[PDB]
Amino acid sequence: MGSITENTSWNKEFSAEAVNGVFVLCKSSSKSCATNDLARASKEYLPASTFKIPNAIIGLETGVIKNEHQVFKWDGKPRAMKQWERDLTLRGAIQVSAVPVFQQIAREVGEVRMQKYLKKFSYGNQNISGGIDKFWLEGQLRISAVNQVEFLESLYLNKLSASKENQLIVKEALVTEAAPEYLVHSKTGFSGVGTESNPGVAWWVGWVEKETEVYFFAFNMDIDNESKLPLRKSIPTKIMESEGII
Numbered sequence: 001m002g003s004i005t006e007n008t009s010w011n012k013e014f015s016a017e018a019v020n021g022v023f024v025l026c027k028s029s030s031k032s033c034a035t036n037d038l039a040r041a042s043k044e045y046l047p048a049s050t051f052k053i054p055n056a057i058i059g060l061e062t063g064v065i066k067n068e069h070q071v072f073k074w075d076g077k078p079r080a081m082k083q084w085e086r087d088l089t090l091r092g093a094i095q096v097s098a099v100p101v102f103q104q105i106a107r108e109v110g111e112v113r114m115q116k117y118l119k120k121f122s123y124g125n126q127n128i129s130g131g132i133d134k135f136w137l138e139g140q141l142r143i144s145a146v147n148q149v150e151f152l153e154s155l156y157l158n159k160l161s162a163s164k165e166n167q168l169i170v171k172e173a174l175v176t177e178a179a180p181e182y183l184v185h186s187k188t189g190f191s192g193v194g195t196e197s198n199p200g201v202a203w204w205v206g207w208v209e210k211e212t213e214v215y216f217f218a219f220n221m222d223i224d225n226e227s228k229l230p231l232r233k234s235i236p237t238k239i240m241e242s243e244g245i246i
């Protein structure tokens with residue numbers, strides 16, 4: 001990251017909802033970032049579902065995901081969310097956020113190759129301990145909002161240590177809004193409601209391409225009640241609207 005500046009006026013959107021969280025927003029052409037909370041911007045949290053971004057790239061890189069047209073077939077046995085109980089494309093599995101699909105990808109990648117690529121990607125604390133199929137869900141892997149926007153900028157620029165084609169495949173799978181001169185790539189996450197005195201984390205990360213500008217963003221918040229989950233999009237959306245992005 002280049003320069004980061006704390007803008008405490010963004011806290012207004014947080015205190016209104018009694019949310020403890022951070023937003024990091026970087027405008028590409030100026031190589032500068034802003035945040036409501038410098039300290040929390042660098043604090044590391046479980047990636048949860050945002051890990052589908054590196055996991056998908058690594059699956060393609062290692063050949064575990066054969067190509068972008070691979071279909072992940074449902075074996076017909078119960079899955080934890082009904083929206084996952086179906087065959088899914090790579091983009092579908094990311095968009096509906098089908099954990100079991102990505103757990104099996106991780107198992108087939110294996111510990112050695114997973115470690116190799118998180119080191120290549122400078123992904124968080126790069127600690128994969130806790131089980132190959134769950135280190136990013138309940139294990140020891142942690143990543144900060146600053147690190148997310150660094151990783152996403154590299155993906156946007158096709159500068160990750162992976163093939164350009166594999167980065168491009170995952171990028172189209174991350175498109176969540178498309179208009180003639182407005183394009184959003186993003187991914188949500190939710191680690192859970194945590195435990196007593198130890199809240200879970202909710203994420204929204206991505207980037208916005210508007211005209212010839214691009215804005216990288218990462219949001220996280222403490223969460224111990226699922227009813228608060230939509231704030232992971234509404235707080236950053238209000239901030240980006242106040243900046244004229246949205």
Ligand SMILES: *C(=O)N1C[C@H](NOS(=O)(=O)O)CC[C@H]1C(N)=O
Pocket residue numbers: 048049050096097098099137187188189190191
């Ligand atoms: C990812 O964080 N998980 C899978 C799924 N993601 O949906 S979300 O991105 O809208 O948060 C549900 C939550 C979470 C999980 N239970 O693992």
Ligand SMILES: [Br-]
Pocket residue numbers: 078079080081099100
């Ligand atoms: Br499941």
Ligand SMILES: [Br-]
Pocket residue numbers: 048049051052098099102103
């Ligand atoms: Br996942």
Ligand SMILES: [Br-]
Pocket residue numbers: 188229230231232233
């Ligand atoms: Br949401």
Ligand code: NA
Pocket residue numbers: 044045046201
């Ligand atoms: Na955490």
